[PDB]
Structure formats: C-alpha cells, structure tokens
C-alpha cells in the first residue's frame, strides 16, 4: 500500500490513452509491482519515426476496491456538483465503440 | 469558488488527491500526490497529472477508468460501493 513515483518494476496490465502534448502520451494504466497492483498514469514518448514508446515515467497509487471505489465516488460526486454527470457519462458511453 | 479537493487516498504524511482548481479564469482538474515537507507543509508534488476540465476531459477519463474496471472484472461492485460512500 504505496505510492510510486515512477514506474521502475512494474509491468503493465492494462493501458489506455487519454490524451497527447507534443508527443509525450498520457496512459491511464494498472500495472503490477511487488505482488501488488497500481493504477497511475504512464507515459509514452515518440521517437523522430513518429511511433510510441513505453517510458518508466509516470506515477500510481494502489488499485483495490477501497481505492477505485474512492475515486469512482470523487468523481462522479465532482461531476454532480458541476451538474454535468449525465452529459459526461453519455459522452463516454460513445467513446466507448469509438 | 469552483474548487473541490477529495482525498483518494492516504498515510501518514502521504496523500493523492483529485481536485478542481481555478487558474487564469479557467478549470483545471488533477490527481497527484501530496506530501509533507520538514515542517510539515503539505505540498503538491510532480507525481500527478492535471489537465482542462472539460466535457471532452472528463468524458475521456471516465470511460478508460469504466473501462479498466470492467476488464478486471469489477465494475458493479465498485459502482456499489460507490454508491454506499455518498450516505456517510
């Protein structure tokens, strides 16, 4: 039960994009280290051949239920308070298929 | 006046946070980690993302975080206990 400051060890068992800023890529992962599971994000550089390349730069924290419980709440509760919820679950029930 | 700051997790000294904060007249919503210095002074660290908050934004990490839930098979029990956290 930590936090990582880096993702030194870890081997990746689920990675999706987010987003891009000229080139570094923000993954939303869950990876495994030291018999323990984490999400966090990982980052993956281009090269000058314009594909992507997995980094050991990123942050995560533990990936339980208590953990993604939390932020599944703190989330949608932030999203409430905007009064956006339902909007922002439609828009990713379609970027769903996407 | 917008901002919101939420605890995802936590130790002695150490805590992630997602927050909503309010920068050159526009949003911004990050998780990072927090830490304390020698006097105790919480300060946020480098070991966070942050980024526009925004229906595009938002919309994109709900569904990957939906998505990783589902693959490891545990989607409605954390939509439950969710669910259980806003009585408390």
């Known amino acids: 039960e930590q ?11 689920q990675s999706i994009i987010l987003w891009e800023k000229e080139g570094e890529q923000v993954r939303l992962t ?6 323990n599971l ?11 051949n314009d594909e992507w390349f997995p980094t050991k730069s990123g942050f995560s924290f533990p990936y339980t239920l208590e ?3 939390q932020l599944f709440y703190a989330f949608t509760q932030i ?3 905007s009064e956006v919820l339902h909007e ?3 828009r990713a029930e379609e970027l769903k298929a996407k």
């Open 79 to 81: 999203l409430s308070e």
């Open 38 to 48: 984490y999400m966090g994000i990982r980052y993956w550089l281009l090269d000058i």
């Open 88 to 90: 922002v679950q439609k």
């Open 30 to 35: 869950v990876s495994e280290f030291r018999g």
């Open 3 to 13: 936090v990582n400051q880096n993702y030194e060890g870890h081997v990746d068992d």
């Open 67 to 69: 953990t993604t419980s």
